[PDB]
Design a protein around this ligand. Structure first.
Ligand SMILES: O[C@@H]1[C@@H](O)[C@H](O[C@@H]2CO[C@@H](O[C@@H]3CO[C@@H](O[C@@H]4CO[C@@H](O)[C@H](O)[C@H]4O)[C@H](O)[C@H]3O)[C@H](O)[C@H]2O)OC[C@H]1O
Length: 380
């Protein structure tokens, strides 16, 4: 049985020989540096009396995925002030109040809140909902727009039902229960599959949707089994419903192991830790750690899912190492402990591309310290 059932979370840093006091100090200093550090480290900026944003430093914009990550980090760290500022920002500037995308979030805006595209990014919506449910379960709801569980249910209603009221498209394909890359296109993104979150949407969503969320959890576990290369454990950034790499798109080649796909190993391992349902997740974690076992972080490239290295370097190599280390939540192979130590000995990334690395870095810091947790509906 998983942490969801037992309430006990693996502390892999403590398992590797780091002291309890060292671990929680390091987690606190990671929070301090990311949220309130120097101009070359921080990725969070407070705005006015009641708002705040996570900055994609590399792209000079604010992303629904980054905002939703910030909210997950804040609720996992018991930081209600930062949580409320981030949510109020996403609510005020990014959430559609009308049209084909009503209740969805414009995927990016300028720091001042000016929308740069109207279309959503479904990985944002699902993290928003999960963070909002945890905020409800930890702190209890407030007055709108801080009625956390009501806001979460509204997002997930749109995610399954959007094209019914009028026009628009759902973010889940009804026929196969799989999350889509965007509402309009019939393919997916393996990194967007969060079966562990769907298990919890099955507990918290609008009642009529709970069966679908349960089916989505199993469908996503099965999908990820089809998406990861059987030898390397590498997955493509964009993939067809059959799990094979999607066609080259107008905005890029997403067929290879690069930025998005790093999260797959981290997501697979967190589902293992929380629910312990699919033993393939141990083997997947072993395989990706074996692929990177004698690759130094300084040599991380773009790779074909078959494991062929490009000359082109990984844009986010610290992100990749963070996700490789987070796989130690599930891995039982010879590389598990080495990756925890390698991650411990890695500082936060600095400079203009640091945002994506440091997001993945923070989730790994939470997970490997036993602090990436389910906040349930339970007796106080
Ligand atoms: O009309 C359509 C557009 O709206 C559509 O936009 C897509 C919306 O989702 C976007 O996905 C974002 C991109 O960021 C991902 O993380 C990035 C990983 O690479 C890093 O370098 C970067 O810092 C990160 O931000 C995030 O998971 C996801 O939410 C996608 O890129 C857009 O293409 O595109 C097609 C139009 O037809």
């Amino acid at each position: 049985k998983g942490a969801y059932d037992t309430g006990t979370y693996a502390n892999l840093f403590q398992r590797s020989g780091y002291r309890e006091d060292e671990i929680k100090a390091r987690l606190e200093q990671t929070w301090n540096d990311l949220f309130y550090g120097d101009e070359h480290t921080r990725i969070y900026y407070p705005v006015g009396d009641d708002k705040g944003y996570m900055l994609d430093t590399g792209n000079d914009d604010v992303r629904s995925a980054g905002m939703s990550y910030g909210m997950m980090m804040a609720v996992q760290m018991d930081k209600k002030h930062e949580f409320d500022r981030l949510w109020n920002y996403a609510y005020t500037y990014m959430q559609h109040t009308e049209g084909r995308y009503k209740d969805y979030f414009a995927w990016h805006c300028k720091p001042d809140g000016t929308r740069l595209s109207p279309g959503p990014a479904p990985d944002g919506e699902e993290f928003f909902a999960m963070a909002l449910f945890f905020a409800s379960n930890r702190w209890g709801d407030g007055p709108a727009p801080y009625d956390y569980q009501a806001q979460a249910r509204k997002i997930l209603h749109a995610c399954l039902h959007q094209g019914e009221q009028g026009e628009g498209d759902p973010m889940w394909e009804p026929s196969n229960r799989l999350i889509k890359f965007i509402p309009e296109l019939p393919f997916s993104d393996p990194s967007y599959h969060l079966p562990h979150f769907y298990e919890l949407f099955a507990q918290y969503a609008n009642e009529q949707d709970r069966t679908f969320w349960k089916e989505a959890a199993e469908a996503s576990r099965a999908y990820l089994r089809t998406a990861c290369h059987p030898v390397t454990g590498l997955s493509p950034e964009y993939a067809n419903y059959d799990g094979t790499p999607a066609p080259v798109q107008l905005h890029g080649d997403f067929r290879h192991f690069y930025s998005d796909a790093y999260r797959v190993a981290a997501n697979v391992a967190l589902d293992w830790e929380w629910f312990r349902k699919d033993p393939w997740q141990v083997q997947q974690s072993n395989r990706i750690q074996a692929f990177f076992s004698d690759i130094d972080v300084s040599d991380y490239r773009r790779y074909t899912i078959e494991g062929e290295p490009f000359n082109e370097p990984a844009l986010h190599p610290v992100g990749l190492l963070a996700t490789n280390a987070m796989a130690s939540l599930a891995a039982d192979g010879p590389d598990a402990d080495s990756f925890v130590k390698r991650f411990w000995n890695t500082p936060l990334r600095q400079g203009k591309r640091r945002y994506y690395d440091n997001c993945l870095y923070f989730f790994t810091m939470l997970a490997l310290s036993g602090n990436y947790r389910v906040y349930q509906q339970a007796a106080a």
